Amino acid sequence: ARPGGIAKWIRVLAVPIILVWVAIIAVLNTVVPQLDVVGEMRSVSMSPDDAPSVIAMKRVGEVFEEFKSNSSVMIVLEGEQPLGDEAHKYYDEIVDKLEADPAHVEHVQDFWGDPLTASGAQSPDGLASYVQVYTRGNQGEALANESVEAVQDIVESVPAPPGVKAYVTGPAALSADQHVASDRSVRVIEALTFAVIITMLLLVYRSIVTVILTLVMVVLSLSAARGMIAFLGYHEIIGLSVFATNLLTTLAIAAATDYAIFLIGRYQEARSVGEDREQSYYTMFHSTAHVVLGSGMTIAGATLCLHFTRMPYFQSLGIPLAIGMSVVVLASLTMGAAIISVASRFGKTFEPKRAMRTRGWRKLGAAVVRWPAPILVTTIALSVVGLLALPGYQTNYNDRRYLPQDLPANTGYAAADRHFSQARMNPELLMIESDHDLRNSADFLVVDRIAKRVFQVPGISRVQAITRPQGTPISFYLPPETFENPDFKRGMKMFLSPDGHAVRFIISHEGDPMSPEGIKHIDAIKQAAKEAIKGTPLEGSKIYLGGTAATFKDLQEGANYDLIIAGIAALCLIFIIMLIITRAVVASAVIVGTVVISLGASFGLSVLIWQHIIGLELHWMVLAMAVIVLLAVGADYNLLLVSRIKEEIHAGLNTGIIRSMGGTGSVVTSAGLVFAFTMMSMAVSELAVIAQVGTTIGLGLLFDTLVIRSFMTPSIAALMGKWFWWPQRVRQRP
């Protein structure tokens, strides 16, 4: 703990460091609009540009020369009276104003305006109708969001008939309203988070000056991280998703508070022993700076490991989170060290106010070292009972239930569900692109065969084709005289390619295409079409199938494998960081394995609460987003405890554990409580996925703070003895 190294440089350059950090924070906050504005502008596609569903939909748009993007929303009309006179008119002005805005609307698939296909766009009771309009964008980008906003504005501009109401729904509408749901509760999230942290810092320190300075450090670090992320995103360097902003804000605040708590706790412990301010600061730095740096590097690397998946949301989550956490770590180490150094020499600023809680934690350490075998067994049992949630763990792929029901997309879905069957606003599009003109009598037998065979597939409730213009059935033969009928000419134009080389089918699911059963439906439809076109003068045609079910098939087929690989990479990277810091293989393995064990209890608590008490099943992204943060932060707490043990080995393996636990008990307890409660502060989010992720991470941090670091790791250390620090040389005796 001799004065020297980076600590002395920071202490002597404290004021310049603070001024430089403040200046760059101001620059990054005054040269770019804001993080929320950038995230709205730089929203990422919900699906990769090379996904089979995206390619199929763009190919359908290109062949038919209608659209070129991958965004579409459904406009549904709901009237108290049956849709009749003046309702068709209202629909007509709506579609006319839609086709007069090429900047947002690419094509309007007008089925209800055509008497041939009018019955196919109406509900059986006749009280509702819908039209699919194709907008510009890729269903998740910003451009798609302004497209949906423009469509809603156009719909609301037209005066409605006395009893007819129009809604704008669809998966693109749901994605667009995700952003507006976030940017109405993100402020509530940050306000509640700051209130919680202020209260808990007041409880921990009982000092107003210390709390104010901790808030200053946290606010400056958060502003630096958010400014860096906004600067990167605004320059189209990184992509930002809706979840990225919320997780970045909460994680930055919580991690900054944790680093401040670590530094201040070490400084105040050094002061309580009876060391002057300079030696106290030097001891704090030499004991906690590497721990904080490694703790932040673990979070940064763990979040970075998400970039290696194929899901665009997870890449948009990965790099920005890593950059934000790294900026938080620098603005914690350098800024907090400088601020502590400056403020210590201004009276009783950071001086401890109440007491230190060694005696209780020393008694707990004595209990742990006395019975290391009976303990760690209770902890393994408490961590594995969460696996009882596997027989019954249900995941939900539909984002409809994870958004407030008052959003325009949810309202439109609710209105459609009153009159139409389930998932009629999410149709599948099947295109079979041939190599010859299909507008002859022979090929319509094949087309009708395809329509009939796809309809006969279980889980398919409606197939709309040229031979079934209304989606319902009317040995087949069309006389050539039908080809000159103008009604049939319009039908072929609306269902066949302009050159006649492609045929289009609209397919509606019996159930929800969100589920993996809807994923099996895609393969069933493709196989049925391939067998239908078998042994006919149409073989070799390229089958394109696109829609919601195909999109989520492309998302989910490799998602589980990608997430497993990402988690394994995160574990490996955290283990490498622990190995670099502690220089002990066994200690690093224990640190990274205890959190893996506690993942069971975290998962059990989350699947219990959300799936049973609340009733809302866990979103299929929640575990993926939560496991990374859990592994990072639990390993960080274990790192702090293990490093403190390492500093105390010279007194003995058992006395070292006892003294280290006594030293770090209250500090790590406060840090873990702050992190967990900041994480669960997302419970007020209007994005139920965000709330689920936050509550899961908070419950996991509460569990491991109360169990793992307290009893499991110390008991493992006591059991291992000299082998805990392997292959490090161990004194092994006082």
Residue numbers in the entry: 21 to 494, 690 to 949
Task: Quote the original article.
We then collected single-particle cryo-EM images of the MmpL4 transporter embedded in LMNG detergent micelles and solved its structure to a resolution of 2.95 Å. Our cryo-EM structure indicates that MmpL4 is monomeric in form with overall dimensions of 110 Å × 75 Å × 55 Å. This transporter consists of a large membrane-spanning domain formed by 12 transmembrane helices (TMs 1–12) and a large periplasmic domain formed by 2 hydrophilic loops (loops 1 and 2), consistent with the signature of the RND superfamily of proteins. It should be noted that our cryo-EM structure contains most MmpL4 residues except for residues 495–689, which presumably form the PD3 subdomain located right above subdomain PD2. It should be noted that our MmpL4 protein is a full-length protein as indicated by size exclusion chromatography (SEC) and SDS-PAGE of the purified protein. It is likely that subdomain PD3 is highly flexible, evidenced by the fact that we did not observe any cryo-EM densities arising from this subdomain even though the contour level of the map was set to a very low threshold. Similar to MmpL3, the structure of the MmpL4 transporter also forms an elongated channel spanning the pocket surrounded by TMs 7–10 at the outer leaflet of the cytoplasmic membrane and the cavity generated between subdomains PD1 and PD2 in the periplasm. The pocket located at the transmembrane domain and the cavity sandwiched between the 2 periplasmic subdomains potentially harbors substrate binding sites for anchoring siderophore substrates such as Mbts. This elongated channel is continuously open and directly connects these 2 potential siderophore-binding sites. Therefore, this conformation of MmpL4 may represent the open-channel state of this transporter, and this channel is likely used to export siderophore substrates. Based on the structural information of MmpL4, residue D278 forms a hydrogen bond with Y852, presumably enabling the transfer of protons to facilitate substrate transport.
